[PDB]
Amino acid sequence: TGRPEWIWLALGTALMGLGTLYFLVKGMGVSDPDAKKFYAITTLVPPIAFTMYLSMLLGYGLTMVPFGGEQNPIYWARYADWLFTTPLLLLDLALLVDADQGTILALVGADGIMIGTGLVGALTKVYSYRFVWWAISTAAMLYILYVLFFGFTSKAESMRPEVASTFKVLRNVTVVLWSAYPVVWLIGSEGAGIVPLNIETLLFMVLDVSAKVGFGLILLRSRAIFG
Ligand SMILES: *C/C=C(C)/C=C/C=C(C)/C=C/C1=C(C)CCCC1(C)C
């Protein structure tokens, strides 16, 4: 076919593939057991994004959903990707500040609701209900951010400054990048259709890559990962 944003899918697959190998390589030359924990988790995040980007580049994970008088193109492979990568990122932040089991389970659960309702909204045919789902998905997100900001940050103070300070950088990159997603969804293909798919795809890879490979790098090159 050759859709305009394939170029962006091509750069997403590429960046994610590099990050994967570099983390893999760096992670298997590490003997520390906790370092090993963070490395296994993080190195798992980019490959999952890689395959989902590949398929899309190659033509899968796309479906035409009717609404607005149009047959709209929704890249659902995007959710099959985030469903597994967002909770692995949360877990990565949660292990850092020694979050409790209830917090994690709730952060991950809340995270399950967000990608699920978001997907249901991306699939919904009554135009206005799409925004209802989008609404529930976003509120689930605000709960997660509130927890990362209010809860986690507090427990990171029971950690060394090197640890509390690697966390606030990662928590900040997460608050800023996550904040953007619901807005992209809104003004683009899933929502208003103001921003065309090709610019939306570009916006999405820039965030996906910053939030994954960007997040991983900062985390795995830190000394705070060591037990
Ligand atoms: C590697 C991928 C990351 C860090 C993805 C983060 C994705 C989000 C924070 C997505 C959020 C969404 C909403 C708040 C509502 C509408 C639909 C979503 C799934 C785009």
Short mmCIF file of C-alpha atoms and ligand atoms in Angstrom, two decimals:
data_model
loop_
_atom_site.label_atom_id
_atom_site.label_comp_id
_atom_site.label_asym_id
_atom_site.label_seq_id
_atom_site.Cartn_x
_atom_site.Cartn_y
_atom_site.Cartn_z
CA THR A 1 0.00 0.00 0.00
CA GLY A 2 2.64 2.54 1.13
CA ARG A 3 0.69 4.73 3.62
CA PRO A 4 2.38 8.10 4.53
CA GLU A 5 3.16 7.17 8.12
CA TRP A 6 4.95 3.93 7.18
CA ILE A 7 8.12 5.94 7.25
CA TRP A 8 7.41 6.62 10.91
CA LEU A 9 6.67 2.92 11.56
CA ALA A 10 10.00 2.15 9.91
CA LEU A 11 11.84 4.48 12.31
CA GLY A 12 9.95 3.07 15.29
CA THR A 13 10.88 -0.52 14.48
CA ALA A 14 14.49 0.59 13.97
CA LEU A 15 14.95 2.56 17.17
CA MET A 16 13.20 -0.13 19.26
CA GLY A 17 15.36 -2.85 17.71
CA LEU A 18 18.56 -1.05 18.60
CA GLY A 19 17.49 -0.35 22.18
CA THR A 20 16.58 -4.01 22.57
CA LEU A 21 19.99 -5.34 21.58
CA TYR A 22 21.90 -2.77 23.57
CA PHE A 23 19.92 -3.59 26.76
CA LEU A 24 20.18 -7.29 26.05
CA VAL A 25 23.96 -7.01 25.60
CA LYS A 26 24.39 -4.75 28.66
CA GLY A 27 22.02 -6.84 30.77
CA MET A 28 23.75 -10.20 30.23
CA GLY A 29 27.15 -8.93 31.26
CA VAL A 30 25.73 -7.89 34.62
CA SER A 31 26.14 -10.23 37.56
CA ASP A 32 24.27 -8.28 40.23
CA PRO A 33 20.93 -10.00 41.09
CA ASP A 34 18.85 -6.79 41.43
CA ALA A 35 20.54 -5.19 38.47
CA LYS A 36 19.46 -8.42 36.75
CA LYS A 37 15.83 -7.74 37.81
CA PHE A 38 15.66 -4.27 36.32
CA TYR A 39 17.50 -5.41 33.22
CA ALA A 40 15.20 -8.33 32.51
CA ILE A 41 12.15 -6.10 32.91
CA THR A 42 13.39 -3.13 30.87
CA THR A 43 14.96 -5.18 28.02
CA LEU A 44 11.56 -6.85 27.61
CA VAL A 45 9.82 -3.53 27.00
CA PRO A 46 11.50 -2.57 23.69
CA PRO A 47 11.19 -5.96 21.86
CA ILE A 48 7.38 -6.07 22.47
CA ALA A 49 7.14 -2.55 20.93
CA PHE A 50 9.41 -3.70 18.11
CA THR A 51 7.25 -6.59 16.94
CA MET A 52 4.04 -4.51 17.17
CA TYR A 53 5.73 -1.78 15.13
CA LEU A 54 6.92 -4.35 12.61
CA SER A 55 3.48 -5.88 12.05
CA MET A 56 1.97 -2.41 11.51
CA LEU A 57 4.75 -1.51 9.11
CA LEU A 58 3.96 -4.85 7.43
CA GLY A 59 0.22 -4.23 7.46
CA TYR A 60 -1.33 -5.80 10.55
CA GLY A 61 -2.97 -4.32 13.66
CA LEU A 62 -5.05 -1.85 11.63
CA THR A 63 -8.82 -1.83 11.34
CA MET A 64 -11.39 0.53 9.76
CA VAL A 65 -13.90 1.75 12.32
CA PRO A 66 -16.98 3.65 11.09
CA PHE A 67 -17.99 6.94 12.72
CA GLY A 68 -18.25 10.54 11.51
CA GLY A 69 -19.45 9.52 8.05
CA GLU A 70 -15.99 7.98 7.52
CA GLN A 71 -14.37 4.59 7.60
CA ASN A 72 -11.57 5.49 10.05
CA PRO A 73 -8.15 3.74 10.33
CA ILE A 74 -7.44 2.65 13.91
CA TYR A 75 -4.05 1.01 14.67
CA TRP A 76 -5.13 -1.37 17.38
CA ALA A 77 -1.80 -3.14 17.41
CA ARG A 78 -0.85 -0.06 19.41
CA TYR A 79 -2.88 -1.33 22.40
CA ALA A 80 -1.56 -4.92 22.14
CA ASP A 81 1.81 -3.28 22.61
CA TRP A 82 1.00 -0.86 25.52
CA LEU A 83 -1.05 -3.46 27.36
CA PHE A 84 2.27 -5.20 28.22
CA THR A 85 4.80 -2.39 28.11
CA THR A 86 3.08 0.18 30.33
CA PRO A 87 2.73 -2.21 33.32
CA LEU A 88 6.35 -3.34 32.94
CA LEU A 89 7.36 0.36 33.18
CA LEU A 90 5.19 0.90 36.29
CA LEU A 91 6.69 -2.20 37.86
CA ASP A 92 10.18 -0.83 37.05
CA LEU A 93 9.36 2.37 39.00
CA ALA A 94 7.63 0.39 41.76
CA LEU A 95 10.59 -1.91 42.40
CA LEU A 96 12.82 1.18 42.68
CA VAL A 97 11.03 2.82 45.66
CA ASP A 98 10.08 -0.54 47.20
CA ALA A 99 6.35 -0.03 46.57
CA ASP A 100 4.08 -2.49 48.41
CA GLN A 101 2.28 -5.41 46.82
CA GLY A 102 -1.11 -3.73 47.06
CA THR A 103 0.14 -0.57 45.34
CA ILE A 104 1.66 -2.54 42.46
CA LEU A 105 -1.35 -4.77 41.97
CA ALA A 106 -3.55 -1.65 41.97
CA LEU A 107 -1.22 0.35 39.69
CA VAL A 108 -1.09 -2.56 37.21
CA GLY A 109 -4.82 -3.18 37.48
CA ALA A 110 -5.63 0.56 36.97
CA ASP A 111 -3.29 0.31 34.03
CA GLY A 112 -5.29 -2.60 32.65
CA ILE A 113 -8.49 -0.54 32.77
CA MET A 114 -6.82 2.37 30.90
CA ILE A 115 -5.65 0.42 27.83
CA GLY A 116 -8.83 -1.62 27.78
CA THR A 117 -11.38 1.18 27.82
CA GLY A 118 -9.09 3.20 25.51
CA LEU A 119 -9.20 0.31 23.02
CA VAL A 120 -12.98 -0.08 23.39
CA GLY A 121 -13.21 3.67 22.67
CA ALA A 122 -10.91 3.42 19.67
CA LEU A 123 -13.31 0.67 18.43
CA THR A 124 -16.67 2.26 19.33
CA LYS A 125 -19.01 3.30 16.53
CA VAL A 126 -21.20 5.93 18.18
CA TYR A 127 -18.85 8.88 17.81
CA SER A 128 -19.70 10.49 21.17
CA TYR A 129 -19.36 7.28 23.24
CA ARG A 130 -15.79 6.96 21.94
CA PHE A 131 -15.12 10.07 24.09
CA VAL A 132 -16.93 8.51 27.02
CA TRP A 133 -14.51 5.58 26.97
CA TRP A 134 -11.64 7.92 26.31
CA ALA A 135 -12.85 9.72 29.47
CA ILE A 136 -12.76 6.61 31.63
CA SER A 137 -9.40 5.55 30.21
CA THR A 138 -7.88 8.96 30.98
CA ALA A 139 -9.20 9.06 34.55
CA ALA A 140 -7.64 5.69 35.15
CA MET A 141 -4.39 7.33 33.98
CA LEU A 142 -4.74 10.28 36.28
CA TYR A 143 -5.10 7.83 39.19
CA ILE A 144 -1.81 6.09 38.20
CA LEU A 145 0.03 9.45 37.86
CA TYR A 146 -1.35 10.67 41.15
CA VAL A 147 0.07 7.45 42.71
CA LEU A 148 3.48 7.81 41.02
CA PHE A 149 3.58 11.43 42.17
CA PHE A 150 2.07 11.29 45.57
CA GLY A 151 2.66 7.77 46.81
CA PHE A 152 5.83 6.47 45.18
CA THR A 153 7.79 9.66 45.48
CA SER A 154 7.26 9.49 49.25
CA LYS A 155 8.66 5.95 49.58
CA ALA A 156 11.65 6.93 47.46
CA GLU A 157 12.72 9.08 50.43
CA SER A 158 13.44 5.92 52.40
CA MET A 159 16.04 5.25 49.67
CA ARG A 160 19.53 6.66 49.15
CA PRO A 161 19.57 10.04 47.40
CA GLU A 162 21.07 8.34 44.35
CA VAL A 163 18.02 6.12 44.30
CA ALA A 164 15.44 8.75 45.15
CA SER A 165 16.99 10.98 42.48
CA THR A 166 16.96 8.37 39.65
CA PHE A 167 13.31 7.85 40.46
CA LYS A 168 12.20 11.48 40.30
CA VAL A 169 13.84 11.78 36.85
CA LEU A 170 12.02 8.62 35.66
CA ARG A 171 8.79 9.69 37.38
CA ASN A 172 9.07 13.07 35.68
CA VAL A 173 9.76 11.67 32.26
CA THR A 174 6.70 9.35 32.83
CA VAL A 175 4.35 12.13 34.01
CA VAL A 176 5.27 14.27 31.02
CA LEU A 177 5.17 11.55 28.38
CA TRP A 178 2.02 9.83 29.69
CA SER A 179 0.22 13.15 29.93
CA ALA A 180 0.65 13.58 26.17
CA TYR A 181 -0.88 10.32 25.00
CA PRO A 182 -4.54 11.09 25.83
CA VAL A 183 -4.15 14.41 24.04
CA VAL A 184 -2.74 12.84 20.88
CA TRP A 185 -5.63 10.33 20.88
CA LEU A 186 -8.11 13.22 21.23
CA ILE A 187 -7.00 15.43 18.35
CA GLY A 188 -6.10 12.61 15.98
CA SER A 189 -7.57 9.49 14.31
CA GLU A 190 -9.33 8.00 17.34
CA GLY A 191 -10.86 11.37 18.17
CA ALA A 192 -11.36 14.74 16.45
CA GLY A 193 -9.50 13.75 13.29
CA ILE A 194 -7.86 17.19 13.45
CA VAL A 195 -4.32 15.83 13.20
CA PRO A 196 -3.88 13.35 10.24
CA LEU A 197 -2.73 9.75 10.88
CA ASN A 198 0.81 10.33 9.55
CA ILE A 199 1.51 13.17 12.03
CA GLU A 200 -0.19 11.11 14.74
CA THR A 201 1.96 8.10 13.98
CA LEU A 202 5.07 10.35 14.19
CA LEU A 203 3.89 11.84 17.54
CA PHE A 204 3.23 8.35 18.83
CA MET A 205 6.65 6.93 17.96
CA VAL A 206 8.42 9.96 19.48
CA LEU A 207 6.60 9.32 22.75
CA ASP A 208 6.82 5.52 22.59
CA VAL A 209 10.58 5.68 21.94
CA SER A 210 11.31 8.41 24.57
CA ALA A 211 9.19 6.57 27.16
CA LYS A 212 10.73 3.16 26.47
CA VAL A 213 14.28 3.41 25.17
CA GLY A 214 14.56 6.83 26.78
CA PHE A 215 13.27 5.46 30.09
CA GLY A 216 15.38 2.29 29.89
CA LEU A 217 18.67 4.12 29.20
CA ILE A 218 18.27 6.49 32.16
CA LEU A 219 17.31 3.54 34.36
CA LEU A 220 19.85 0.88 33.31
CA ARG A 221 22.84 3.22 33.25
CA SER A 222 22.08 4.32 36.81
CA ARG A 223 23.77 2.96 39.93
CA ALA A 224 20.39 2.88 41.75
CA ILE A 225 19.44 -0.46 40.13
CA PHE A 226 22.06 -2.34 42.16
CA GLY A 227 20.83 -4.23 45.21
C1 LIG B 1 5.66 2.55 25.83
C2 LIG B 1 4.35 3.07 25.94
C3 LIG B 1 3.92 3.94 26.91
C4 LIG B 1 4.73 4.52 28.05
C5 LIG B 1 2.50 4.23 26.69
C6 LIG B 1 1.75 5.05 27.47
C7 LIG B 1 0.36 5.14 27.00
C8 LIG B 1 -0.56 5.91 27.67
C9 LIG B 1 -0.29 6.71 28.93
C10 LIG B 1 -1.86 5.87 27.04
C11 LIG B 1 -3.01 6.50 27.43
C12 LIG B 1 -4.38 6.56 26.85
C13 LIG B 1 -5.28 7.35 27.60
C14 LIG B 1 -5.10 8.11 28.88
C15 LIG B 1 -6.76 7.53 27.12
C16 LIG B 1 -7.06 7.19 25.64
C17 LIG B 1 -6.31 6.03 25.07
C18 LIG B 1 -4.81 5.82 25.49
C19 LIG B 1 -4.64 4.27 25.61
C20 LIG B 1 -4.02 6.37 24.22
#
